[PDB]
Design a protein around this ligand. Structure first.
Ligand code: B84
Ligand code: GLC
Ligand code: NA
Length: 447
């Protein structure tokens, strides 16, 4: 409105502790709703049972394959477990073409199967039939540890014939059509789950997995008596919260800003994954772009004139946000970004662009922290210890590559979780290694 000022505009992103506690308590309410049989179907946070349990008592050595499929690339990993346990891995990255991102799920899996076939050829692992763990970074309703149907794509990925289908069967069918090799798919897990398992290997206190990358989600070990969707009260079972859909029932309405509505309105999945849209690297850069456009329309930035690039959706990558915030103080990192976008920025413009990035990324960290606090505080209600010692495994480009996200996030989480001694583990290739590690236990369990 009238009298607009840079600080006043960027201040809209602030979230006071009372705001974070309110977000946190609402997340806990939605988590309870997704866990109970009565409200599950209408719950925004699905709390999907993963069928990964705490009870198996043994594992085994051997060679295990891992497939890790996200929204743009995928990697194959060969994990060798030997002997105390010794774990050695090899891997290869692949990128899904175009006659895929728009094509059928069958086309997608055929390409993935061709890639796995080539990987095994190159490592002379064709003769031996290997077990494969599958990390699939999308919402899946599991029927067992190796059976789940895709509920819906997220993060703007698409491929017809996938939603409503058993993802494992899709991979199995494709491996079949290739017919030049055998492979047993022994488990399919979400990337949050694989990440928690890869960290659990190194630290058994790890019972929470989290991802802050293209998307944002979390899994944690819940008491079986609380998982109403699976008969039994013995032990714990990992639950994939799919908390990115938090707010999809209106729970965040009072916090949403115009920039958030615009990002949602123009996204590939309007009205869905609203919490994730406040945090995820898929949306962070676009949020900063809308904020910068607002500043120029108010004649507070670039003397009111934006460039063609700046005015096209997706032009401000989250990678750019991270680079802006890494600036040493001389504006070179910032200038390198703006100049490449067709802008002739002043030193002041650069400083304004940095404060805008900080406003958006700080809000992401704070929103994300209320979610994690909600998970950790809930868990603490099932332990008799005064101080709960818990380890959170985390993966994701925002958490790992953004200059100061990690620290803001950690600090905010800690302020909201008294009586909890939290250790954060930044996972290295966990999404992929966790799938292989769970396969060894699943293979041993199946004798
Ligand atoms: C076969 O069908 C089924 C059914 C249920 C099930 N649950 C499983 N659970 C596991 O594999 C559990 C899940 C953990 C999450 C936190 C609590 C325990 C698991 C336990 C231990 C690890 S591990 O410590 O990473 N590790 C893997 C490598 N081997 C050589 C040593 C042990 C990895 C996974 S496998 C399985 N298979
Ligand atoms: O990859 C991070 C996350 O992205 C989205 O939120 C997906 O829906 C979820 O499954 C995943 O875990
Ligand atoms: Na149960």
């Amino acid at each position: 409105g009238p009298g607009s000022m840079v600080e006043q505009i960027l201040a809209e992103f602030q979230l006071q502790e009372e705001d974070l506690k309110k977000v946190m308590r609402r997340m806990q309410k939605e988590m309870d709703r997704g866990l109970r049989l009565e409200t599950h179907e209408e719950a925004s946070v699905k709390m999907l049972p993963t069928y990964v349990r705490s009870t198996p008592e043994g594992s085994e050595v051997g060679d295990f394959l891992s497939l890790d499929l996200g929204g743009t690339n995928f990697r194959v990993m060969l994990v060798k477990v030997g002997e105390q346990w010794s774990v050695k891995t090899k891997h290869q990255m692949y990128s899904i073409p175009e006659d895929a991102m728009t094509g059928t799920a069958e086309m997608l899996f055929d390409y993935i199967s061709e890639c796995i076939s080539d990987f095994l050829d190159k490592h002379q692992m064709k003769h031996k039939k290997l077990p494969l763990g599958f990390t699939f970074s999308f919402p899946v309703r599991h029927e067992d540890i190796d059976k789940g149907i895709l509920l819906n794509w997220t993060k703007g990925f698409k491929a017809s014939g996938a939603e409503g289908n058993n993802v494992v069967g899709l991979l199995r069918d494709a491996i079949k059509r290739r017919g030049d090799f055998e492979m047993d798919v022994v488990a399919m897990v979400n990337d949050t789950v694989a990440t928690m398992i890869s960290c659990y290997y190194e630290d058994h206190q790890c019972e929470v997995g989290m991802i802050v990358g293209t998307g944002c989600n979390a899994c944690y070990m819940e008491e079986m008596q609380n998982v109403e969707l699976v008969e039994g009260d013995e032990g714990r079972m990992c639950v994939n919260t799919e908390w990115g859909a938090f707010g999809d029932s209106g729970e965040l309405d009072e916090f949403l800003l115009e920039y958030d509505r615009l990002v949602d309105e123009s996204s590939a999945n309007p009205g869905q994954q609203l919490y994730e849209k406040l945090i995820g690297g898929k949306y962070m850069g676009e949020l900063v772009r809308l904020v910068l456009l607002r500043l120029v329309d108010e004649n507070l930035l670039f003397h009111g004139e934006a460039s063609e690039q700046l005015r096209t959706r997706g032009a401000f990558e989250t990678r750019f946000v991270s680079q802006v915030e890494s600036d040493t103080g001389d504006r070179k990192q910032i200038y390198n970004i703006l100049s490449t976008l067709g802008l002739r920025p002043s030193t002041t413009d650069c400083d304004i662009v940095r404060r805008a990035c900080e406003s958006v990324s700080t809000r992401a960290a704070h929103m994300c922290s209320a979610g994690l606090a909600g998970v950790i505080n809930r868990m603490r209600e099932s332990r008799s210890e005064d101080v709960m010692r818990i380890t959170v495994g985390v993966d994701g480009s925002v958490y790992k590559l953004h200059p100061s996200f990690k620290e803001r996030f950690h600090a905010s989480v800690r302020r909201l979780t008294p009586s909890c001694e939290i250790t954060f583990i930044e996972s290295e290739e966990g999404s992929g290694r966790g799938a292989a590690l769970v396969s060894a236990v699943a293979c041993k369990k199946a004798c």
